[PDB]
Amino acid sequence: KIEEGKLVIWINGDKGYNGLAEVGKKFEKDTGIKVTVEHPDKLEEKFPQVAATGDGPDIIFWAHDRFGGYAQSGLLAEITPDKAFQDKLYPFTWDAVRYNGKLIAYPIAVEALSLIYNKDLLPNPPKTWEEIPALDKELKAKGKSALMFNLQEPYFTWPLIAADGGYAFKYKYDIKDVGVDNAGAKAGLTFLVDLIKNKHMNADTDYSIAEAAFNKGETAMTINGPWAWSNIDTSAVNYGVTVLPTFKGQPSKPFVGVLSAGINAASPNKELAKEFLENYLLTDEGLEAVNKDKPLGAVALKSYEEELAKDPRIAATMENAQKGEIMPNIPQMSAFWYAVRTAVINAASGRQTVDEALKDAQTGSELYRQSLEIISRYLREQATGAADTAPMGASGATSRKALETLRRVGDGVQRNHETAFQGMLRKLDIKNEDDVKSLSRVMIHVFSDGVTNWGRIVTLISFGAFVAKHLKTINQESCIEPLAESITDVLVRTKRDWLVKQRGWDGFVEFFHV
Ligand SMILES: Cc1nn(C)c(COc2ccc(N3CCN(S(=O)(=O)N(C)C)CC3)cc2)c1-c1cccc2c(CCCOc3cccc4ccccc34)c(C(=O)O)n(CCN3CCOCC3)c12
Numbered sequence: 241k242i243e244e245g246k247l248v249i250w251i252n253g254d255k256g257y258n259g260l261a262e263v264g265k266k267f268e269k270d271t272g273i274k275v276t277v278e279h280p281d282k283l284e285e286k287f288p289q290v291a292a293t294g295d296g297p298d299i300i301f302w303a304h305d306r307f308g309g310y311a312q313s314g315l316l317a318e319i320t321p322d323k324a325f326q327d328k329l330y331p332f333t334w335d336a337v338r339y340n341g342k343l344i345a346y347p348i349a350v351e352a353l354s355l356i357y358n359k360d361l362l363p364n365p366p367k368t369w370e371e372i373p374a375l376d377k378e379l380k381a382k383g384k385s386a387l388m389f390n391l392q393e394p395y396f397t398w399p400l401i402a403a404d405g406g407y408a409f410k411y412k413y414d415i416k417d418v419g420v421d422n423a424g425a426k427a428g429l430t431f432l433v434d435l436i437k438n439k440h441m442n443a444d445t446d447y448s449i450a451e452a453a454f455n456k457g458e459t460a461m462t463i464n465g466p467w468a469w470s471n472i473d474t475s476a477v478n479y480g481v482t483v484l485p486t487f488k489g490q491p492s493k494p495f496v497g498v499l500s501a502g503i504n505a506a507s508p509n510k511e512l513a514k515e516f517l518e519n520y521l522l523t524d525e526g527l528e529a530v531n532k533d534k535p536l537g538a539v540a541l542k543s544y545e546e547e548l549a550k551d552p553r554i555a556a557t558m559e560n561a562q563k564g565e566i567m568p569n570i571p572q573m574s575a576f577w578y579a580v581r582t583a584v585i586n587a588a589s590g591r592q593t594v595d596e597a598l599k600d601a602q603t604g605s606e607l608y609r610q611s612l613e614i615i616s617r618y619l620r621e622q623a624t625g626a627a628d629t630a631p632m633g634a635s636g637a638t639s640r641k642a643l644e645t646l647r648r649v650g651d652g653v654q655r656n657h658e659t660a661f662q663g664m665l666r667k668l669d670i671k672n673e674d675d676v677k678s679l680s681r682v683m684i685h686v687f688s689d690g691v692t693n694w695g696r697i698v699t700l701i702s703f704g705a706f707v708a709k710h711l712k713t714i715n716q717e718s719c720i721e722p723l724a725e726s727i728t729d730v731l732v733r734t735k736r737d738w739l740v741k742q743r744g745w746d747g748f749v750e751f752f753h754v
Pocket residue numbers: 649650653657660661664668679682683686687694695696698699700701703704707727
């Protein structure tokens with residue numbers, strides 16, 4: 241689907257895409273290859289949809305956190321720079337784009353949020369979040385406000401939420417330990433909600449409203465990344481970039497992202513893209529060209545980062561980074577972000593309490609792991625005749641009773657529907673681990689085209705167990721876990737919002753309670 245003999249690049253609209261296009265034209269002047277740069281809306285959600293069908297751009301730019309999901313889905317080509325090139329980037333930025341032992345992207349720049357403040361209104365920025373209400377009272381009396389920043393994207397509210405103990409996935413990362421609804425997360429999000437309640441902030445403020453308020457001098461402070469500096473420069477505001485305020489004595493902890501460039505697994509121009517990224521973009525002149533459009537942050541290229549680091553705005557960026565944490569790149573990051581976005585917005589607007597909002601977000605971030613735990617154990621004990629002796633772990637009461645419930649209602653379905661199950665199991669003939677990958681197509685077609693309820697979910701998992709028994713008999717026991725993962729992916733992404741609304745697997749257990 242992708243045209244050969246050229247390069248299409250996607251990058252987000254807040255980045256220096258005009259600068260990126262300039263590097264493209266220099267590539268063109270050398271090779272005769274045209275370089276088109278686009279910045280479509282919601283490109284991080286469009287990429288996986290289009291690239292799954294073999295379409296999309298040759299190169300996609302985004303912070304590294306999304307790339308684990310893309311690599312897991314087979315959407316990114318493995319990148320293979322020689323040691324001479326790898327030595328030119330900071331080791332830690334390469335780590336950010338390593339997934340299951342392979343490099344899946346070229347790292348570009350390190351991004352962290354800072355506090356940006358107007359030196360003509362606040363010559364001394366607050367060191368604590370706690371003192372911002374009184375400062376706002378002080379500024380309101382002068383016709384100004386203390387602080388405005390984007391409240392629609394959780395990226396910007398997360399520093400406050402993690403400050404007192406909130407976190408995504410514990411530590412390696414234990415995908416089973418989610419820290420979205422613990423006391424620390426609550427304490428931070430409560431402080432944000434209280435700021436809104438006391439008229440210090442507006443739940444409706446987004447990126448554009450906050451940017452224009454600061455850049456016109458109506459608000460004294462904003463929270464943003466290095467890409468926003470260019471527009472402040474133009475407004476001629478006298479701004480400083482500094483450490484984020486502490487909360488309850490501890491630092492704000494922003495999720496640090498590494499802007500990175502991935503090559504589409506279906507692109508016919510992988511040698512061209514490697515040549516552009518390694519020998520044109522990731523060079524002193526290439527990054528400067530982008531940086532002059534919208535600042536990149538602390539770039540991954542050592543030769544150039546040595547000059548930018550001297551800029552206090554970059555030193556402040558890297559100080560805020562060292563207090564924060566590099567984002568995971570695991571595939572569940574997207575699900576985490578979707579959940580926390582909904583929770584921050586509902587809590588800020590009043591649709592839910594902080595308790596409600598974060599509980600749902602906790603159930604959403606845990607949905608995939610918990611579903612896989614249940615579905616995999618059921619499939620394997622059904623196929624082998626023996627249960628898994630391993631502890632259930634986090635939320636283990638739910639999983640244990642979900643599985644017990646499933647044993648009850650699932651075994652009755654395999655018996656009563658043995659005729660339909662046998663027939664479906666022949667139309668599909670499963671003999672290979674590869675065939676199991678072909679299932680998702682028909683599996684989704686059937687599961688999607690109807691109503692939603694726990695009974696069809698039981699059918700879904702029960703045929704899964706029916707198919708697992710067969711795989712075991714033909715010595716294909718290795719295919720049962722990839723089968724459990726495919727069932728779980730189909731279930732969680734097609735019924736995410738319904739399942740969260742049912743209180744997840746607690747609803748399951750309650751719905752089929754005797
Ligand atoms: C084809 C086909 N003909 N018939 C007759 C069936 C069974 O029919 C059933 C109808 C109802 C129920 N129950 C609901 C109420 N309760 S309960 O709540 O009261 N309780 C006590 C718990 C439990 C019992 C069970 C089975 C099938 C049939 C086969 C394989 C799988 C299903 C699925 C699950 C989705 C498909 O998954 C896979 C598809 C392909 C490979 C797969 C590998 C793994 C896993 C899943 C796979 C569905 C479904 O989406 O439902 N269906 C049926 C879809 N039909 C519906 C009727 O019209 C036409 C379509 C299936």
